[PDB]
Amino acid sequence: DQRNEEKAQREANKKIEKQLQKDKQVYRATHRLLLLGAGESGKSTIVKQTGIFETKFQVDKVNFHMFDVGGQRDERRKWIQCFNDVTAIIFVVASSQTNRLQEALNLFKSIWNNRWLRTISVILFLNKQDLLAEKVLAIEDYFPEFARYTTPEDATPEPGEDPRVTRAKYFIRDEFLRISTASGDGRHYCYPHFTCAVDTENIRRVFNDCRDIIQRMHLRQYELL
Amino acid sequence: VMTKEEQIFLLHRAQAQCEKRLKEVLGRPCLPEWDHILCWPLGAPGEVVAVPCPDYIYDFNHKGHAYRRCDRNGSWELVPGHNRTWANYSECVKFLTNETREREVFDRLAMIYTVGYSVSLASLTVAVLILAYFRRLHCTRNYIHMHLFLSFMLRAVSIFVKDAVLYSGATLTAAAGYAGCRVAVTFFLYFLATNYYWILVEGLYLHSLIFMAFFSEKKYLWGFTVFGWGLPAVFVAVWVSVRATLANTGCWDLSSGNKKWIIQVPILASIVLNFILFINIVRVLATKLRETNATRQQYRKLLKSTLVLMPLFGVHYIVFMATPYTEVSGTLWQVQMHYEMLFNSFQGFFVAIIYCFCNGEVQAEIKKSWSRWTLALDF
Amino acid sequence: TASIAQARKLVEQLKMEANIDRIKVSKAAADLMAYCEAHAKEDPLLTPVPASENPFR
Amino acid sequence: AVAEIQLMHQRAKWIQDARRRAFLHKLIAEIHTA
Amino acid sequence: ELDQLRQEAEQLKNQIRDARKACADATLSQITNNIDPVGRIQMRTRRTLRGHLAKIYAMHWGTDSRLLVSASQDGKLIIWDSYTTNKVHAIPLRSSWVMTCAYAPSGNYVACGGLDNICSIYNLKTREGNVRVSRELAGHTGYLSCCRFLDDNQIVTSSGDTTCALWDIETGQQTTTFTGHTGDVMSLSLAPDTRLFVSGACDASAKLWDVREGMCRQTFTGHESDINAICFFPNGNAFATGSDDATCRLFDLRADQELMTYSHDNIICGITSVSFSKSGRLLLAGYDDFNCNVWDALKADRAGVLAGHDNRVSCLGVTDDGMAVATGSWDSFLKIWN
Amino acid sequence: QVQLQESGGGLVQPGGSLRLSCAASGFTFSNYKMNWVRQAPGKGLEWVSDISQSGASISYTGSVKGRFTISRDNAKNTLYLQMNSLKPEDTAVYYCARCPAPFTRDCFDVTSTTYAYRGQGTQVTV
Ligand SMILES: CC(C)CCC[C@@H](C)[C@H]1CC[C@H]2[C@@H]3CC=C4C[C@@H](O)CC[C@]4(C)[C@H]3CC[C@]12C
Ligand SMILES: CC(C)CCC[C@@H](C)[C@H]1CC[C@H]2[C@@H]3CC=C4C[C@@H](O)CC[C@]4(C)[C@H]3CC[C@]12C
Ligand SMILES: CC(C)CCC[C@@H](C)[C@H]1CC[C@H]2[C@@H]3CC=C4C[C@@H](O)CC[C@]4(C)[C@H]3CC[C@]12C
Ligand SMILES: CC(C)CCC[C@@H](C)[C@H]1CC[C@H]2[C@@H]3CC=C4C[C@@H](O)CC[C@]4(C)[C@H]3CC[C@]12C
Ligand SMILES: CC(C)CCC[C@@H](C)[C@H]1CC[C@H]2[C@@H]3CC=C4C[C@@H](O)CC[C@]4(C)[C@H]3CC[C@]12C
Ligand SMILES: CC(C)CCC[C@@H](C)[C@H]1CC[C@H]2[C@@H]3CC=C4C[C@@H](O)CC[C@]4(C)[C@H]3CC[C@]12C
Ligand SMILES: CC(C)CCC[C@@H](C)[C@H]1CC[C@H]2[C@@H]3CC=C4C[C@@H](O)CC[C@]4(C)[C@H]3CC[C@]12C
Ligand SMILES: CCCCCCCCCCCCCCCC(=O)O
Ligand SMILES: CCCCCCCCCCCCCCCC(=O)O
Ligand SMILES: CCCCCCCCCCCCCCCC(=O)O
B180 and B121 inside one domain: yes
Cβ distance E277 to C43 less than 8 Å, yes or no, reads yes
Is residue A92 exposed (0-12), middle (13-18) or buried (19+ Cβ within 10 Å)?
Answer: buried
Q: Does B324 reach chain A within 8 Å, measured CB to CB?
A: no
d(CA B175, CA A162): 90
Torsion of Cα atoms, B23 then B24 then B28 then B29, to 10°: -90
Among B49, B70, B93, the domain boundary falls at B93
Q: Name the method of structure determination.
A: cryo-EM
CA angle A211, A212, A213 (to 5 degrees): 90
d(CA F72, CA B136): 46
Cβ neighbour number for residue A6 with a 10 Å cutoff: 11
- DSSP assignment of D2-34: -HHHHHHHHHHHHHHHHHHHHHHHHHHHHH---
Could you tell me if E40 lies within 8 Å of chain C, comparing CB atoms? no
Report how many helices (DSSP H) and strands (DSSP E) chain A contains, helices first.
6, 6
- Order of strands across the sheet that contains E238-243: E227-232, E238-243, E248-252, E258-262
Q: In this structure, are residues F19 and F80 in contact, taking their beta carbons and an 8 Å threshold?
A: yes
State whether B288 and A215 contact (CB < 8 Å): yes
Nearest CA in chain F to A113: F106
A107/B14 Cα distance (integer angstroms): 101
- Classified as helix, coil or strand, F123 is strand
* Chain centre to alpha carbon of residue F55: 14
Tally the domains of chain B.
Answer: 2
3-state DSSP helix/strand/coil percent for chain D, to nearest 5? 85, 0, 15
CA distances to B35, B37, D20 from B13, rounded to whole Å, are: 14, 12, 18
> Which ranges of E53-108 would DSSP assign to H, the alpha helix?
none
* Helical segments of C1-57, H only: 2-18, 25-38
Q: Does E134 touch chain C (CB under 8 A)?
A: no
Strand partners, E87: E80
Residue E76 and residue E60: Cα distance in Å, rounded? Answer: 15
The residue type found at A170 is: Y
H or E stretch including E243?
Answer: strand E238-243
The CA distance from F78 to F96, in Å, is 11
The residues pairing with E318 across neighbouring beta strands, listed in sequence order, are E325
- Partnered with residue B346 across adjacent β-strands are none
For E168, the 3-state DSSP assignment is: strand
CB E140 within 8 A of CB E157: yes
Element (H, E) at E165: strand E164-168
**Cα–Cα dist E234/C40, whole Å:** 13
Q: Are F97 and F39 in contact (CB under 8 A)?
A: no
Asked if B136 and E307 come within 8 Å (Cβ–Cβ), the reply is no
> Mind listing the domains of chain E with CATH numbers?
1-338 (2.130.10.10)
DSSP H or E run through E201: strand E196-201
**For residues C26 and C32, what is the distance between their CA atoms, to the nearest angstrom?**
11
Kindly compute the dihedral angle of the four CA atoms of residues A46, A49, A53, A56, in this order, to the nearest 10 degrees: -130
Of the candidates A168, A185, A86, the residue with the CA atom closest to the CA atom of residue A132: A168
Whole-number Å distance between alpha carbons of A51 and B347: 58
Q: Is B13 exposed, middle or buried (0-12, 13-18, 19+ CB in 10 A)?
A: exposed
DSSP letter for each residue of A104-139:
HHHHHHHHHH-GGGSS--EEEEEE-HHHHHHTTT--
CA dist., res. B30 & res. B72, Å (int)? 9
Dihedral pair phi/psi, residue C56, rounded to 5°: -95, 0
> Which of D3, D12, D24 comes nearest B341 by C-beta?
D3
How many structural domains compose chain D? 1
B14-20 contacts: CB < 8 A, separation 24 or more? B14/B39, B14/B54, B14/B56
- How far away, in angstroms, is B230 Cα from ligand 3 center? 6
Run of H or E including B192: helix B180-211
Atom of ligand 2 nearest to the CA of B187: 4
Query: In this structure, are B204 and B247 located in the same domain?
Result: yes
Q: Write out the DSSP string of A49-84.
A: ---EEEEEEESSS-EEEEEEE-S--S--TTGGGG-S
> Measured between alpha carbons, how far is A117 from A104 in angstroms, rounded to an integer?
17
Residue type, B237: A
Question: Using CA of residue B269, residue B271, residue B276, residue B280, what is the dihedral sign?
Answer: positive
What is the distance between the alpha carbons of residues A214 and A88, in angstroms, rounded to a whole number?
10
Which residues 12-51 of F are in CB contact (within 8 Å) with E?
A: 26-28
User: Do E305 and B375 make contact, defined as CB atoms within 8 angstroms?
Assistant: yes
| DSSP H/E element including E295 | strand E292-296
Contact (CB, 8 A) for E187 and E146 = yes
Burial category of E209 from C-beta neighbours within 10 Å (exposed 0-12, middle 13-18, buried 19 and up): buried
Domain span at residue B308 reads: 106-373
Q: Whose CA is nearest to atom 18 of ligand 7?
A: B324
Helix D3-31 with B162-171: angle, nearest 10 deg: 10
Distance of CA E61 to the CA centre of its chain: 12
Between helix B4-25 and helix D3-31 the angle, nearest 10°, is 40
Residue-level length of chain A: 225
Check: CB of residue A149 under 8 Å from CB of residue A171: yes
Going by C-alpha positions, the residue among A75, E60, E45, B267 that lies closest to residue F118 is: A75
Which CATH number goes with the domain that contains B70?
4.10.1240.10
Shared-domain flag, residues B223 and B244: yes
E-assigned strand segments in B53-89: 65-69
Q: Which ligand 1 atom minimizes the distance to the CA of B183? A: 8
**Residues B179, B183, B186, B192, Cα dihedral to 10°:** -150
Task: Name the closest-CA residue to atom 15, ligand 4.
Answer: B258
Checking DSSP bridges between strand A122-127 and strand A88-94, what pairing results, if any? parallel
Q: Which domains does chain C have, with CATH numbers?
A: 1-57 (4.10.260.10)
Chain A residues in contact with F110 by the CB 8 A cut-off are 74, 103, 106-107
Widest distance between CA atoms in chain D: 46
CA B261 to ligand 4 centroid distance, Å: 7
Q: Which residue in A217, A219, A220 has the most chain B C-beta atoms within 10 A of its own C-beta, making it the best mutation to test that interface?
A: A219
- Tell me how far the alpha carbon of residue B255 lies from the centroid of ligand 10, in angstroms: 30
CB E211 within 8 A of CB E199: no
List the one residue out of E86, E83, E89, E95 whose CA is nearest residue E54. E95
Contact E207, E162 (CB under 8 A): no
| Cα E104 to Cα A41, E59, E122, E149, E295, distances in angstroms | 44, 13, 10, 6, 29
d(CA B116, CA B352): 12
Q: Any idea what DSSP says for residue B352? A: I
Query: Can you tell me whether residue E37 is helix, strand or coil?
Result: coil
Answer positive or negative: Cα dihedral of B358, B360, B363, B365.
Answer: negative
How many angstroms separate the CA atoms of E295 and E276, rounded? 10
Taking a C-beta distance cutoff of 8 angstroms, is the pair E158, E197 a contact?
A: no
Give the 3-state secondary structure percentages of chain A, helix then strand then coil, rounded to 5.
45, 15, 40
Cα E198 to Cα E227: distance, rounded to the nearest angstrom: 12
- Cβ contact (<8 Å) for A28 and B216? no
Chain D residues with a Cβ under 8 Å from any Cβ in chain B: 1-21, 23-25, 27-28, 31-33
Q: Which CATH number belongs to the domain containing residue B222 in this structure?
A: 1.20.1070.10
Close Cβ partners of E332 (under 8 Å, ≥ 6 residues apart): E50, E52, E53, E54, E55, E56, E72
Total tally of structural domains belonging to chain A? 1
Residue pair E143/E130 in contact by the 8 Å Cβ criterion: no
Q: What is the dihedral angle through the alpha carbons of E19, E21, E24, E26, rounded to the nearest 10 degrees?
A: -170
Sheet with F10-11: list strands edge to edge: F10-11, F122-125, F92-98, F34-39, F45-51, F58-60
Q: How far is CA A177 from the centre of its chain?
A: 15
Element (H, E) at E58: strand E56-61
DSSP secondary structure string, F23-92? EEESS-GGG--EEEEEE-TTS-EEEEEEE-SSS--EEE-STTTTTEEEEEETTTTEEEEEE-S--TT--E
Q: What is the DSSP letter of A32?
A: E
Query: Can you say whether the dihedral through the CA atoms of B77, B82, B84, B86 is positive or negative?
Result: negative
Supply the residue whose CA is at minimum distance from atom 17 of ligand 4. B258
CA neighbor of E327 nearest in space, from E282, E278, E293, E281: E293
Distance from C-alpha of A107 to C-alpha of B249, rounded to nearest angstrom? 81
* CA of A211 relative to ligand 2 center, distance in Å: 36
Kindly state the DSSP code that residue B318 receives in the 8-state scheme.
G
Long-range contacts of A136-141 (CB under 8 A, 24+ apart): A136/A162, A136/A164, A136/A165, A139/A168
Query: Do the Cβ atoms of B87 and D32 come closer than 8 Å?
Result: yes
* Chain centroid, CA B74 distance in Å: 56
d(CA B146, CA B134): 13
**Distance of alpha carbon E163 from alpha carbon E143, whole angstroms:** 11
Exposed / middle / buried, residue B332 (Cβ in 10 Å: 0-12, 13-18, 19+): exposed
In the β-sheet with F68-73, what is the strand arrangement from edge to edge? F3-7, F18-25, F78-83, F68-73
Q: Give the residues surrounding ligand 7 with Cβ less than 6 Å away.
A: B 265, 268-269, 272-273, 322, 324
Inter-residue contact E145 to E160 (CB < 8 Å): yes
E184 shares contact with chain A (CB less than 8 Å): yes
Rounded to 5 degrees, what are φ and ψ at A204? -65, -40
Listing DSSP states for B152-167 in one string gives: HHHHHHHHHTHHHHHH
Cross-strand partners of F92:
F124
Q: Are the Cβ atoms of B372 and E305 closer than 8 angstroms? A: no
SS3 (DSSP) at B176: helix
F95 touches F121 (CB < 8 A)? yes
Pairwise CA distance, residues B6 & B96, whole Å: 21
| CA–CA gap between residue B349 and residue B7 (Å, rounded) | 46
Query: For the residues of C42-53, what is the DSSP string, one character each?
Result: T-TTTSPPPTTT
Q: Are F19 and F70 in contact (CB under 8 A)?
A: no
Domain boundary among B93, B118, B150: B93
Residue B248 is assigned to a structural domain of this protein: yes
In this structure, what is the dihedral angle of CA atoms B316, B319, B321, B324, given to the nearest 10 degrees? -140
Q: What is the CATH number of the domain that holds A7?
A: 3.40.50.300
Closest by Cα among E309, E324, E334, E269 to E56: E334
CA E285 to chain centroid: 11
Query: Largest Cα–Cα distance of chain E, in whole Å?
Result: 66
Hey, what amino acid is at B268? L
Residues of the domain holding A19: 1-225
Cβ–Cβ under 8 Å, residues E204 and E224: yes
**Cβ(B182) to ligand 1 under 6 A?**
yes
Are A132 and A146 within 8 A, CB to CB? no
The CA-atom distances, in angstroms, between A139 and each of B231, E108, F111 are: 68, 62, 25
What 3-state class would DSSP assign to B144? Answer: helix
First to last CA, chain D: 46
Query: Which residues, 6 or more positions from F33, have their beta carbon under 8 angstroms from its beta carbon?
Result: F50, F51, F52, F53, F99, F104, F105, F107
Instruction: Tell me how far apart the alpha carbons of residues E58 and E330 are, in angstroms, rounded to a whole number.
Output: 10
Q: How far apart are CA C8 and CA A181, in angstroms?
A: 51
- F45 pairs with which residues across the strands? F39
Q: Angle formed by the axes of helices B162-171 and B180-211, to 10°?
A: 150
B240 lines ligand 1 (CB under 6 A): yes
Q: How far is CA E69 from the centre of its chain?
A: 15
| The dihedral sign for the CA sequence E158, E164, E166, E170 | negative
Asked if E270 and F101 come within 8 Å (Cβ–Cβ), the reply is yes
C19, C21, C25, C31 alpha-carbon torsion, rounded to 10°? -160
- In three-state secondary structure terms, B367 is helix
CB contacts under 8 A, A 68-87 vs E, are 71-73, 75, 77-79, 82, 85
Are the C-beta atoms of E217 and E210 separated by less than 8 Å?
A: yes
Is ligand 2 within 6 A of the CB of residue B89?
A: no
Q: At what angle do helices D3-31 and B331-351 cross, to 10 degrees?
A: 140
- Residues counted in chain F: 126
CA distance C28 to C22: 10
Is the minimum distance from the CB of B186 to ligand 1 under 6 angstroms?
Answer: yes
Identity of residue B181: C
CB E241 within 8 A of CB E276: no
A177 close to B (CB below 8 A): yes
Q: Are F118 and F4 in contact (CB under 8 A)?
A: yes
**Residues E75/E63, Cβ–Cβ less than 8 Å:** no
**Do E270 and F104 contact (CB within 8 A), yes or no?**
no
Domain of D12, in residue numbers: 1-34
Strand partners, F46: F38
Helix (H, G, I), strand (E, B) or coil at A187: coil
Contact C39, E280 (CB under 8 A): yes
List CB contacts of B192: < 8 A, sequence separation 6 or more: B155, B158, D2, D4, D5
Cβ contacts of A61 on chain B, cutoff 8 Å: 214
A89: β partners: A34, A122
- Write the burial class of residue E142 (CB in 10 Å: 0-12 exposed, 13-18 middle, 19+ buried): buried
CA F52 to chain centre: 12
